[PDB]
Design a protein around this ligand. Structure first.
Ligand SMILES: Cc1ccc(O)c(C(=O)O)c1
Length: 327
């Protein structure tokens, strides 16, 4: 069957820690007071929660309340533990409280206020400098959570909250996040279609932090090339074909050969034969001011089929693309 894989960094972070850290099922939730929070307006509803702008009446501060749907139980406890472990980390959303919602009778997570604007609202109109600046800020969040033994697994523009006026960023929605344990097989039904890594699309379960680096590369490609999304699949199958039209089929078959993966036979009639395209193929008069040799070299090193070959978050922070960013 498939050949096993291990992360090349932060491999054994969870193995050395006491079970209290990663055994989210044994965690005891310290319940706050639901009356401290007054709901103001509904911001949105996703698959697993409803999100509201609210006010913390004990200090008049604005907060965000995420009321969980009563679907999964193990999933709820995992999100709370991950948020508590990461609290105070660079550009990580701050969990302020956990209360029991009086109506839904489910946990409600209370977060520090952020502007009601996601990165998808701004990321197609940034300058070259601001793409570099904000990507460096996202990398600080990813290296921190990876160093803490956690993969986000849902990196996408909607999950990056930005306050452009204040040049501040937060990585949000840790509901799909998981503790990395070497040799563990994970569910491939994570991330949004356009940001899914080839490991998810070929059903390779022993993936790691590097999945977040492919999703980050998809975001960068969409920003520097002004193409939303960069890989525009009609479904999870066509998503891999769209990737193969850019990266080529030869490196795809080498990746599948290396990990001894059984590619779904559905692909035999749709994948075709494609050579790797040079990154200059995507450059045009409308995006050329966002492209540089450094941007293309950095993107090339994130968008690799082999998850073990992608830059790690710390390696990404060292790249020449960020030499222009004031630190
Ligand atoms: C601050 C904020 C806003 C919306 C959200 O959905 C989240 C979250 O899921 O963590 C956080």
């Amino acid at each position: 069957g498939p050949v096993p894989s291990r992360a090349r960094v932060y491999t054994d972070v969870n193995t050395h820690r006491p079970s209290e850290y990663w055994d989210y099922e044994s965690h005891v939730v310290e319940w706050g007071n639901q009356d401290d929070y007054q709901l103001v307006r509904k911001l949105g509803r996703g698959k697993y929660s409803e999100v509201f702008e609210a006010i913390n009446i004990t200090n008049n501060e604005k907060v965000v309340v995420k009321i969980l749907k009563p679907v999964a139980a193990a999933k709820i406890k995992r999100e709370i533990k991950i948020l508590e472990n990461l609290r105070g980390g660079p550009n990580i959303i701050t969990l302020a409280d956990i209360v029991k919602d009086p109506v839904s009778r489910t946990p409600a997570l209370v977060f520090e206020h952020v502007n009601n604007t996601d990165f998808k609202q701004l990321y197609q109109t940034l300058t070259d400098y601001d793409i570099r600046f904000y990507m460096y800020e996202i990398l600080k969040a990813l290296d921190y959570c990876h160093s803490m033994g956690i993969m986000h697994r849902d990196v996408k523009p909607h999950n990056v909250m930005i306050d452009h006026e204040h040049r501040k960023l937060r990585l949000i929605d840790w509901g799909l996040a998981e503790f990395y344990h070497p040799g563990q097989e994970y569910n491939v039904r994570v991330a949004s279609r356009y940001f899914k890594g080839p490991e998810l699309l070929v059903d390779y379960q022993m993936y790691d932090y590097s999945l977040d680096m492919w999703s980050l590369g998809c975001m960068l490609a969409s920003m520097i090339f002004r193409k939303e999304p960069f890989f525009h699949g009609h479904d999870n199958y066509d998503q891999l074909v769209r990737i193969a039209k850019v990266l080529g089929t030869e490196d795809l078959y080498d990746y599948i050969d290396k990990y001894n993966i059984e590619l779904d036979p559905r692909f035999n009639d749709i994948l075709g034969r494609h050579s790797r395209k040079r990154w200059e193929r995507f450059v045009h008069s409308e995006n050329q001011h966002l492209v540089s040799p450094e941007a293309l070299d950095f993107l090339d090193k994130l968008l690799r089929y082999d998850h073990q070959s992608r830059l790690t978050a710390r390696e990404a922070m060292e790249h020449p693309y960020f030499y222009t960013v004031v630190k």
